[PDB]
Design a protein around this ligand. Structure first.
Ligand SMILES: CC(C)C[C@@H](C(=O)N[C@@H](Cc1ccc(OCc2ccccc2)cc1)C(=O)NC(C)(C)C)N(C)Cc1ccc(C(C)(C)C)cc1
Ligand SMILES: *[C@@H]1O[C@H](CO)[C@@H](O[C@@H]2O[C@H](CO)[C@@H](O)[C@H](O[C@@H]3O[C@H](CO)[C@@H](O)[C@H](O)[C@@H]3O)[C@H]2NC(C)=O)[C@H](O)[C@H]1NC(C)=O
Ligand SMILES: *[C@@H]1O[C@H](CO)[C@@H](O[C@@H]2O[C@H](CO)[C@@H](O[C@@H]3O[C@H](CO)[C@@H](O)[C@H](O)[C@@H]3O)[C@H](O)[C@H]2NC(C)=O)[C@H](O)[C@H]1NC(C)=O
Ligand SMILES: *[C@@H]1O[C@H](CO)[C@@H](O[C@@H]2O[C@H](CO)[C@@H](O[C@@H]3O[C@H](CO)[C@@H](O)[C@H](O)[C@@H]3O)[C@H](O)[C@H]2NC(C)=O)[C@H](O)[C@H]1NC(C)=O
Ligand SMILES: CCCCCCCCCCCCCCCC
Ligand SMILES: CCCCCCCCCCCCCCCC
Ligand SMILES: *[C@@H]1O[C@H](CO)[C@@H](O)[C@H](O)[C@H]1NC(C)=O
Ligand SMILES: *[C@@H]1O[C@H](CO)[C@@H](O)[C@H](O)[C@H]1NC(C)=O
Ligand SMILES: *[C@@H]1O[C@H](CO)[C@@H](O)[C@H](O)[C@H]1NC(C)=O
Ligand SMILES: *[C@@H]1O[C@H](CO)[C@@H](O)[C@H](O)[C@H]1NC(C)=O
Ligand SMILES: *[C@@H]1O[C@H](CO)[C@@H](O)[C@H](O)[C@H]1NC(C)=O
Ligand SMILES: *[C@@H]1O[C@H](CO)[C@@H](O)[C@H](O)[C@H]1NC(C)=O
Ligand SMILES: *[C@@H]1O[C@H](CO)[C@@H](O)[C@H](O)[C@H]1NC(C)=O
Ligand SMILES: *[C@@H]1O[C@H](CO)[C@@H](O)[C@H](O)[C@H]1NC(C)=O
Ligand SMILES: [Ca+2]
Lengths: 49, 49, 49, 930
């Protein structure tokens, strides 16, 4: 998730950050933003959907 | 990171063109500084938004 | 709704990044834009496409 | 042309003037004494200002309340509107009365000093308010200095808090309050402040391009390295290394290279082209750094060894690398924790402590600018502790002034914090400088101490740095130095790049850098002013060092320019009958007159519109006698004498004839300034500069003791060539007392048709071309070449051009122009390095014949050089043959990159670094790792 110009706070780098991100996706709020980040990380929409 | 410091102007690189913006000592929108503000903040948290 | 989010209105033939993260249209009911811009094809879309 | 008539007119009036010698030795000594006096005056001003600044800061009482005692000052970025509501709580703003001054060209108020506070710095905090309180004594000493020397330009205190207080109160340039004009100026990044704040460095920027720095961290690291390089002068040596389990150079440089514009650009490109990958290794990187700082085979500034570590964080301290390589602690280590992250920052802060360094954090762009100024704040501790041995005046490279004045050099002197001294206290931060005082010297102010009008238009002065850069040179233009292909640096132009480079000139440059004195007479290829020809000159360089400074002055002087005519005009009536010729109402018996816009008198303002200047010159001549001390009598005497001689030529030989079929214009140009062109019709087609010393043909025709034909410009929008003609000129070569001196040039603007008819008239007694020096088609016979008259012949049929060069009748020199405007391409106009070439007569032979071996064909030519001129006739008979037009020989100012810097740093030009520098003091308190 080390994108240019930014690095999201909801990332899966360490275990506290991963566990908080999974908790936030469970509650349902803003899971789509994390999805967009996790799609852009695996290459562009072109190759990471 | 102090109200003493947070005066005058500063250069904002957000727009990708340098622009001078004022320095404002602001408070966040949902801010816990009272039991009535904490009730509203916790309500907005509980609704998930 | 196929391919309707790809017309963003770009600067005046400068080939730069489009202005605004919203689709547009050159027609009447769609969202027009302003400021020497042309609503032309080849914008990946909102939310990185 | 009437060379003989002007000549014998000149010898006809030996009683009207005196011939005087140009003793180049005395001229150089006098100008060197004058320049050293000027710089010592500025040094005295700096000493006064620094002494008062130290004294008045020693007796300052710190405060936190300025509401009860306001500070009254003029902020430079204040709008002219009478706004009573533009005041800070603790400061009341002055509203000044601005007069227009000739010296500065801006609104100037002598009643108080102005203040510049950067936008990113709040202008009412405690530090800023205290500085604005104790700088009023600086304001008063500013007044005193300007009162004892009315020629002073900007004199300024560059505070270390961000302020800047220059004496002549003038509004900031364009950035007070203007959209898209943001004010990024910061006094502590300026070259003069960087120079006076410390001693020359030996950096080595270790960039940590490992895996963990990908994304925003690498962006901030490359921007930070660029902004760090932008604080290195030409006395500083820097390389950039990068390590990820293996340390390597980021660029083509293998050692410490000088930090000039070209090398800094190469390093910046290499850092911008850098990518992050792999595991970190702080030991293999610092080993590389300490090894590259142990290289003494290369040129260096043996001073202030540093390591700049641009990492993010880690759990590796590398104690043993430091204990092995840096045990005497000769090398500092400044560690930068760039990025927004949560890695451990303990070893990073410890490397700075155990290696006399400092620790800086760069969380985001916007924090980049301040921390570079801050290592430089650290580096000045050893300089402070050396009390008065470190207070020495230093002059910077030629740079473009901020408050636009053109080209200036600034003389700096640092100001020391002396609060606890001889009454010793804890002396907490008494190791840091308060600021740097600078005073500007205009480059046009130095130009006025080297009078140029008693010399030939080919003779001139030039000064030099210890690095070889020119303080003063005819080819130094007020433009930034180009650094490559387009897509606040100083104007650092080397001596070998302001001229053509022989080996004799390298010897002369090395001799001047060492500060010796000598003379040297030799033969030089002197490029013509229009940058289109090369002549085989005859020069005599004499040089001396300027005492008390690092500069060395020299005087180029042609062998025939050892004598000049001194006008003996003291009759007050003869000068009047000469002057009456100059009003623009007699331009039908005398030619269309233009006058060189020289500084005849100070009450005359030079004008680009020449006839305006002629009108004011006539007006001032009308009432001239009472203005005796107002201006120099020699210039006006000589110009009037030359006007009289020119009139006697134009009436007694040109007005008796009135008409020749071949000619289209007859002109005479004289060193005094008179350039009367006869018919007054071609005077509208006349496009030569009013100042004769900047006339390319005039300078060319003096070295060349023969007839020189200047081919008109091709495809130039204007009067053109057909309805103007082609220029022809020869220089008068009078002899007085058996001395060779050439006071003027006469010439003819031969019409193209009257030559083409005579050239094709004899054809009964088709391809025939006339070429001059530089291989330009003067005129031809095919009548389609004459359409492209004056155009370079290589553009016409390049195959013959290459072959005729191959016989070596045309040698060529390719050089570089670093100060040329440039059309930007793709990957208004930027400045690049253009690579201009000029051709000339390689050999002295007169007849040339051969066969052109065109591809699968054959072509024949014969070349004959017309005697007593610069022409060659080519008899080639071949048109429309098989295509040998593969490429073109385009003699044009071609955009290019400069010389390859990766090859020019292995045989660098000789250069003498600063002698005294201050580092590694034992009283320095290292317990401030920040
Ligand atoms: C699960 C659903 C079928 C019903 C569910 C519900 O609609 N939640 C909202 C989101 C939400 C959440 C918490 C809210 O603050 C009230 C609150 C706070 C803390 C605990 C309980 C209630 C307001 C809105 C939702 O997303 N609704 C969709 C239909 C899925 C779009 N609420 C919780 C049933 C409910 C509501 C109110 C009460 C009273 C307190 C007795 C008045 C009792 C019971
Ligand atoms: C082509 O046109 C004419 C051809 O007649 C050239 O002028 C002539 O040049 C020859 C050169 O040797 C002269 O003899 C001709 O007469 C001269 O005229 C001058 C005038 O001052 C006399 O002093 C000489 O004693 C001699 O009599 C001359 N004739 C004329 C009418 O000019 C002309 O130069 C040439 N074109 C060009 C561009 O050169
Ligand atoms: C030049 O050096 C002197 C001392 O070496 C500096 O003066 C000292 O500045 C410090 C601030 O860094 C003062 O400390 C402050 O004192 C006030 C009031 O007592 C207090 O409110 C602050 O919290 C802080 O402790 C100190 O008093 C002052 N004087 C002395 C004798 O130490 C001076 O600032 C230096 N010059 C510049 C331009 O900074
Ligand atoms: C600029 O133009 C000048 C024109 O003089 C060039 O100087 C000449 O360059 C040629 C080519 O190297 C020299 O010829 C060489 O002479 C040496 C010594 O005899 C010989 O050993 C070589 O085989 C070759 O023939 C020539 O001597 C030299 N002229 C002078 C007066 O020294 C110059 O090269 C051009 N370019 C630059 C960058 O200056
Ligand atoms: C660049 C446009 C075409 C790229 C190829 C198609 C990629 C999209 C398909 C994958 C979508 C994944 C979600 C599936 C949910 C059922
Ligand atoms: C200066 C104090 C004024 C604070 C007023 C803020 C309004 C807050 C409304 C509280 C709503 C509570 C919702 C949850 C109740 C269980
Ligand atoms: C400079 O100083 C040297 C020796 O001190 C002296 O010989 C020379 O004449 C001086 N030059 C000038 C221009 O004063
Ligand atoms: C230096 O200053 C003195 C007086 O302060 C003045 O007479 C002299 O002309 C100055 N020198 C120059 C070169 O201006
Ligand atoms: C500092 O401020 C005080 C109070 O305003 C003033 O009296 C004093 O003159 C100021 N210092 C200087 C150097 O002007
Ligand atoms: C420099 O840039 C070129 C072109 O982008 C690239 O191929 C090359 O790898 C870069 N240099 C390094 C050392 O990566
Ligand atoms: C410098 O030169 C010496 C001898 O010429 C050589 O042994 C050494 O490797 C060179 N490089 C350094 C960094 O000392
Ligand atoms: C100057 O020119 C003359 C002849 O024009 C020549 O003899 C002399 O050698 C030249 N000067 C030098 C230094 O070569
Ligand atoms: C130059 O000045 C003269 C005299 O005022 C005027 O007649 C003429 O138009 C001016 N020309 C230009 C180009 O300004
Ligand atoms: C001339 O051309 C030949 C071959 O075309 C080439 O070898 C040579 O270098 C060229 N120059 C000279 C001076 O002979
Ligand atoms: Ca790492």
């Amino acid at each position: 998730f080390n994108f240019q110009d930014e690095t999201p706070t909801t990332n899966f780098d360490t275990f506290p950050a991963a566990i908080l991100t999974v908790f936030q996706i469970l509650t349902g709020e803003d899971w789509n933003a994390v999805m967009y980040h996790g799609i852009e990380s695996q290459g562009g929409v072109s190759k990471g959907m | 990171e102090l109200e003493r410091d947070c005066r005058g102007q500063y250069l904002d690189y957000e727009k990708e063109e340098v622009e001078a913006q004022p320095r404002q000592w602001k408070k966040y929108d949902f801010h816990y500084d009272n039991v009535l503000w904490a009730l509203l903040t916790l309500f907005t948290v509980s609704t998930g938004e | 709704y196929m391919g309707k989010f790809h017309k963003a209105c770009f600067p005046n033939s400068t080939d730069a990044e489009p202005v605004g993260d919203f689709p547009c249209g050159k027609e009447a009911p769609a969202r027009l834009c302003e400021g020497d811009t042309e609503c032309r094809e080849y914008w990946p879309g909102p939310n990185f496409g | 042309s009437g060379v003989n008539q002007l000549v014998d007119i000149y010898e006809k009036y030996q009683d009207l003037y005196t011939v005087e010698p140009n003793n180049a030795r005395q001229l150089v000594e006098i100008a060197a004494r004058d320049i050293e006096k000027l710089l010592s005056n500025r040094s005295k001003a700096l000493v006064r200002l620094a002494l008062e600044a130290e004294k008045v800061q020693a007796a300052h009482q710190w405060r936190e309340d300025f509401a009860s005692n306001e500070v009254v000052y003029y902020n430079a970025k204040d709008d002219l509107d009478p706004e009573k509501n533009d005041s800070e709580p603790g400061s009341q703003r002055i509203k000044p009365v601005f007069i227009e001054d000739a010296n500065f060209g801006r609104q100037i108020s002598y009643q108080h000093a102005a203040v510049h506070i950067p936008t990113d710095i709040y202008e009412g905090s405690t530090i800023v308010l205290n500085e604005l309180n104790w700088t009023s004594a600086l304001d008063e000493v500013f007044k005193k200095n300007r009162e004892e020397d009315p020629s002073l330009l900007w004199q300024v205190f560059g505070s270390a808090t961000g302020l800047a207080r220059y004496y002549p109160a003038s509004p900031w340039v364009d950035n007070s309050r203007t959209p898209n004009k943001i004010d990024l100026y910061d006094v502590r990044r300026r070259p003069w402040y960087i120079q006076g704040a410390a001693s020359p460095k030996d950096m080595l920027i270790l960039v940590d391009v490992s895996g963990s720095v990908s994304g925003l961290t690498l962006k901030l690291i490359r921007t930070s390295v660029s902004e760090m390089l932008e604080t290195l002068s030409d006395d500083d040596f820097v390389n950039v290394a990068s390590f990820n389990s293996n340390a390597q150079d980021v660029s083509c440089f293998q050692h410490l290279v000088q930090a000039n514009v070209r090398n800094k650009k190469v390093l910046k490109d290499a850092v911008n082209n850098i990518t992050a990958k792999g595991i970190t290794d702080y030991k293999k990187g610092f080993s590389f750094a300490f090894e590259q700082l142990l290289n003494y085979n290369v040129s260096r500034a043996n001073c202030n060894k540093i390591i700049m570590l641009f990492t993010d964080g880690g759990e590796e301290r590398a104690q043993e690398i430091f204990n092995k390589y840096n045990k005497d602690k000769k090398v500092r280590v400044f560690t930068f924790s760039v990025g927004q992250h949560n890695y451990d920052r303990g070893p990073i802060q410890w490397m700075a402590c155990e290696n006399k360094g400092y620790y800086y954090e760069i969380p985001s762009i916007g924090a980049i600018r301040i921390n570079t100024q801050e290592y430089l704040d650290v580096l000045g501790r050893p300089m402070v502790l050396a009390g008065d041995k470190a207070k020495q005046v230093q002059w910077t490279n030629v740079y473009l002034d901020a408050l636009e004045l053109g080209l200036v050099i600034t003389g700096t002197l640092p100001v020391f914090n002396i609060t606890g001294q001889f009454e010793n206290k804890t002396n907490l931060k008494n190791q840091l400088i308060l600021g740097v005082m600078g005073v500007d010297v205009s480059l046009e102010d130095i130009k006025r101490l080297t009078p140029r009008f008693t010399l030939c238009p080919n003779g001139y002065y030039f000064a030099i740095d210890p690095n070889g850069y020119v303080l003063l040179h005819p080819n130094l233009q007020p433009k930034p130095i180009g650094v490559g292909i387009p897509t606040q640096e100083p104007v650092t132009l080397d001596f070998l790049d302001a001229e053509l480079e022989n080996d004799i000139k390298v010897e002369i440059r090395n001799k001047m850098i060492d500060g010796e004195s000598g003379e040297k007479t030799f033969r030089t290829l002197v490029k013509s002013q229009d940058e289109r020809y090369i002549d085989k000159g005859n020069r005599t360089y004499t040089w001396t060092p300027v005492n008390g400074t690092d500069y060395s002055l020299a005087l180029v002087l042609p062998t025939y320019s050892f004598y000049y005519i001194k006008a003996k005009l003291e009759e007050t009536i003869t000068q009047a009958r000469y002057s009456e010729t100059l009003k623009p109402d007699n331009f039908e018996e005398s030619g269309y007159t233009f006058i060189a816009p020289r500084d005849y008198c100070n009450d005359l303002k030079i004008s680009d519109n020449n006839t305006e200047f002629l009108l004011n010159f006539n007006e001032f001549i009308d009432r001239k006698t009472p203005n005796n001390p107002s201006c120099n009598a020699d210039l006006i005497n000589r110009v009037l004498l030359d006007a009289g001689f020119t009139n006697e030529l134009v009436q007694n030989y040109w007005s008796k004839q009135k008409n020749i079929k071949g000619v289209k214009a007859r002109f005479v140009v004289t060193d005094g300034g008179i350039t009367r062109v006869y018919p007054k019709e071609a005077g509208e087609n006349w496009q030569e500069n009013p100042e004769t010393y900047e006339d390319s043909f005039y300078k060319r025709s003096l070295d060349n003791d023969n007839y020189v034909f200047t081919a008109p410009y091709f495809n130039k929008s204007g009067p053109g060539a057909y309805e103007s003609g082609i220029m022809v000129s020869k220089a008068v070569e009078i002899y007085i007392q058996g001395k060779l001196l050439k006071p003027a040039v006469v010439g003819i603007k031969i019409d193209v048709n009257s030559w083409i008819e005579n050239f094709t008239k004899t054809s009964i007694r088709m391809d025939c071309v006339i070429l001059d020096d530089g291989g330009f088609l003067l005129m031809a016979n095919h009548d389609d070449y004459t359409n492209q008259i004056g155009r370079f012949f290589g553009e016409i049929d390049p195959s013959l051009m290459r072959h005729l060069v191959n016989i070596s009748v045309y040698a060529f020199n390719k050089s570089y122009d670093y100060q040329s405007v440039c059309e930007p391409g793709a990957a208004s106009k930027q400045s690049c390095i253009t690579e201009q070439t000029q051709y000339f007569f390689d050999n002295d032979s007169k007849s040339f014949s051969g066969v052109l071996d065109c591809g699968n064909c054959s072509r024949i030519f014969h070349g004959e050089k017309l005697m007593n001129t610069n022409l060659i006739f080519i008899m080639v008979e071949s048109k429309g043959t098989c295509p040998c037009d593969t490429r073109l020989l385009i003699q044009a100012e071609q955009t290019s990159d400069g010389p390859n810097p990766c090859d020019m740093v292995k045989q660098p030009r000789y250069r003498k670094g600063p002698d005294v520098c201050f580092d590694n003091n034992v009283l320095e308190d290292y317990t401030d790792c920040g």
